[PDB]
Write a protein that binds this DNA or RNA. Sequence first.
RNA 1: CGCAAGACGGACCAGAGCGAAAGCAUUUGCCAAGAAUGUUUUCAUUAAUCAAGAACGAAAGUCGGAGGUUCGAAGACGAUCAGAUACCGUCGUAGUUCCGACCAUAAACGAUGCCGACCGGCGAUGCGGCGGCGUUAUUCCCAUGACCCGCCGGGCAGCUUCCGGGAAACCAAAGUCUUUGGGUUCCGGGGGGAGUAUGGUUGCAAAGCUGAAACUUAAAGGAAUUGACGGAAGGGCACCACC
Lengths: 71, 98, 221, 217, 25, 83, 129, 132
Amino acid sequence: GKCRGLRTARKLRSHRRDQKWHDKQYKKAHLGTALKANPFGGASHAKGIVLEKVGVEAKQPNSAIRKCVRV
Amino acid sequence: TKKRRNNGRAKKGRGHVQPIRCTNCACCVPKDKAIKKFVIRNIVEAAAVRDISEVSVFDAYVLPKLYVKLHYCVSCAIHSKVVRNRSREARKDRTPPP
Amino acid sequence: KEWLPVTKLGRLVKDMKIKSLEEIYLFSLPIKESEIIDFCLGAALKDEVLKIMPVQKQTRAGQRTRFKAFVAIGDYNGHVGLGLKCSKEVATAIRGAIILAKLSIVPVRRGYWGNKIGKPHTVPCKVTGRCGSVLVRLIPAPRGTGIVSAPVPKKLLLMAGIDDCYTSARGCTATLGNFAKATFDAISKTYSYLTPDLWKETVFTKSPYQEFTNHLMKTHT
Amino acid sequence: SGALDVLQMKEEDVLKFLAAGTHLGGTNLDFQMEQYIYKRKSDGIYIINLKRTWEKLLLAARAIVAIENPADVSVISSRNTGQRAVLKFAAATGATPIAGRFTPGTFTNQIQAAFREPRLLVVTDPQADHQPLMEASYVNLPTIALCNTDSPLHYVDIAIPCNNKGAHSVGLMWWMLAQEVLRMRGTISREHPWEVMPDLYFYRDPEEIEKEEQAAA
Amino acid sequence: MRAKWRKKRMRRLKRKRRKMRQRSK
Amino acid sequence: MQSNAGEFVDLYVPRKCSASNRIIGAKDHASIPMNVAEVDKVTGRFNGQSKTYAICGAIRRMGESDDSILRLAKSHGIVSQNF
Amino acid sequence: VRMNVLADALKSINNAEKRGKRQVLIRPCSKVIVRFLTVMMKHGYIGEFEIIDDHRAGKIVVNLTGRLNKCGVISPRFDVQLKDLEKWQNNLLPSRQFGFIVLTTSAGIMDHEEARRKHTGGKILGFFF
Amino acid sequence: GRVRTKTVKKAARVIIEKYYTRLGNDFHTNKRVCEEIAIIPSKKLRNKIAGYVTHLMKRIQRGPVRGISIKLQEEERERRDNYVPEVSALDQEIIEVDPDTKEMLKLLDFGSLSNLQVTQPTVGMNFKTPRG
RNA sequence: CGCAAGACGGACCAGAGCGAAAGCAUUUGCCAAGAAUGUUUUCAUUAAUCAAGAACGAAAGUCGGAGGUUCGAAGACGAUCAGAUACCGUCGUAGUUCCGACCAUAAACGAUGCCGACCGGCGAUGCGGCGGCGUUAUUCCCAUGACCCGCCGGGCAGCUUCCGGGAAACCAAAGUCUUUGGGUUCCGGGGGGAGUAUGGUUGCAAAGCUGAAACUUAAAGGAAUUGACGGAAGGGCACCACC
């Protein structure tokens, strides 16, 4: 900490509370924007319908077809 | 990184200095920043002081010198070999070489 | 197998006349012979190589791959050293680092947590030691705690003879050069820390050079 | 050295100090050397206090006599002004000389043949002999220094404030230091002033050697 | 791309968005 | 340095700087127990006994080892009080 | 400005230890400083001092040994109970063998091992080991 | 072209260190010395050694050489052990003493001696080499 | 040779000063201001730092009025080139100059918040003060100036070093730090997306201030080292180099 005064509890608490938003993983779990745009909506599993089977091209030096499924 | 302890210049407690127009270029270099030579020189270099004294009117008339102060920018001092890339230790030497 | 010594200290260590290396450590004499530590701490002293680290300098055409060897050393009651040797073959780097560990071995001071019962088992106080960004705090723990630390300083503290110890390392500890020397700098500052137990004055006993100067003038040239 | 009239500042030694110019020091003063100088003259010369010049040479001469083997006192000069003086002091006291070219790593490197391992150093100038002071920081070597008014006290343990710049005020301060050490071992008695003349301890100018032959032809 | 001209191309691009929001307002 | 029986347990008691009271490290190689001679009151010669001083590494490279010797020898009555 | 007189006066005598001054001077004199130094002196980390009266805040020349490793100050003055005195001494001091947190109590300024005897908590001043 | 290599110059500085007594000025005599006092496996290299030996040997006829240390240079140190001058430069009866050096001796025991000349101060105190 | 104009204030000019910063250099007069030093004056804690709120703020740019010598975005042309709608040349619009309102940003940098303490040395300088031989002008003496030897305080710097620190470069601060706390304000949390979208607010406008996310990615990055390379500066050498 910086300000160490004995009656500086509300500043030291409130300054953290503001600067904790600048933490990436805090703002992913305290703004509901990630929880909104999470395709499962906060589930570990989800049932869906296979509408097309699509073979994805592997990225850098690894040259291969990654056989995925659009659900 | 910070290559020099001064900022390749001679302001330390100013904030601002007047810009100089360079002699080779017309660059706007700060005055303290700019490489300066007060060139004092005879009107002829070596080979002509013989003959111009021979056909002179007055008996042993000393000729006038040519007092011009040059202001070189960093680019036109190193191109015309006025200043030069010294070693990372020997840069610090602020001794005008004889 | 002889070791006919070179330095003035090494002469008396061959003679069986200076019987403790605690007499060497008292006068801060530079041990610069390999076989001074091989003499006293001969049959107890355990060598473990921390890591073989292949270093490279990019030259005109191709790289020169040399091999850095970090050797932790120490008998399991008091003495430890951390030697580093860079060589072109690994088997000489491992060989050369075990020697360079010995020249720079220190005694660890060991004290007590709370009650002062039996033999000492922990660091006498809290000592920090560092090189680079790696800061290694040593903390005295109660009996039967063990070395609560990373695998690496545990390997130097199991060799120190310190049974029970806490740590709180801080920095790029992944680099084993800075991390082994930080924890080594800590266990060297255990005896260089003036506790209120040691206010009782230093009686200046005679140096091993001061006493046997009459031997130093009859044994060799 | 203190409150003994046996080792008190002798009357015949002050008349050597004034002629030699040991009092007559440098133009700049080192902050570490204020304690050894009475007063600064006009024309910038620091008057080195000749008791506190004397007093410091006694304690220096004590620490040499406290070495049981008189041969492991490494007596070093690099500059000409004390090249002879050290090589005579080494003969008088029985000490070890290196007069000119102090090889870096003599005290530190083992495999070097020139690996002497001394017990006390005597230095002609802490700057001229900067190198012996630093190899004195790697192996446990205490230091006597023939200090000047400006010469530093970095890695020197018993400073002797002297005019080691002057030609005839080096050998004169090796003369006091050679004498004092020899008496305390029980060789020279304070009855008779010493057989050796203080003019032996002077580096002779080769100009004044090709002059002395012409003068004394 | 210089960070000075990247800025200049964002300033022209923002200028074009005030231009095209006004077509609806 | 005692246990809880009172017996001395640590394997060596390191030296301590006579000038600054700071204990000399087992590898502080700029630290030196300088021996100063003792003079017989009227003979003016080495008694065979000495005066032994420890000045730690940091003081020599600070440049204060000879100011301290000049002050410590004064308390042992070597250098004249007046000085 | 000078807001903690005890903080400056202990830092001034901490720099003298780390440098190696044989005695040290501190400019303003709170009674808290003298009451701090008496606890330092009775444990015997420092030698005797004498205060220097000018009709102002007092000055103090403290005669140092080289025993004092660090002289600390805990600003702000945390009010401490007997249960919490263990937590303060188990991180701020080197071991459970030596080192002394002096903290002001209603029984006057005194060390932590005495606060366990007298059975009185209070506001933390600093430390020395 | 003719620059002596370290295998020539080191045989030059050990043969003179050991066998100074046997050598001389003449090349052809100490060409032949090098056969008895050394095992030189070449005809040519022996002459290269013995050539610069005679060069150094003509220099030890004069004075001190850098990389040589012999029993005769020990005898010079023994010869120069015993120089004796006439009564000293330090035993004068006119010795120049400043008033400020007269003041400090007056605070010593030796306030007024028999054999000193006191002076007057050099007023116009200019003792610094100017700036630039 | 004269003249009229509008700019600008060389050399003197400095690791010199002042100002809160931006900035500020012809002579004099005028009008307020200010530090530093001096102080055996006076009040007697009146203070430090500061959300909100505000003053000022280079250049460019905007609005109006005046002025337009030089320079000169845009633009006209001549070159250069494969091309140059670039560098280079000659012209020239806005502007550059001033007056009154706007704008509030710069690598606005010492890339280093401010107040305080403590912790080495060294030689300079700037301002005030104090004291000290002598040199010098007012000559007809004092006191002032000019120097000359120092000291104190304050300021801009400089050198030095195992103070110590740090990833190092470097730093008497960037030190007094796991031995972690003098006070306090702003502020950062992998690279991007992005200073973007959106909402407010400011402005005549250009734009400023506040300011995300979806997504994307395993590195981006700092200091240093070795090499290779250079349309960098040198120092060599060779009839597979020239002379």
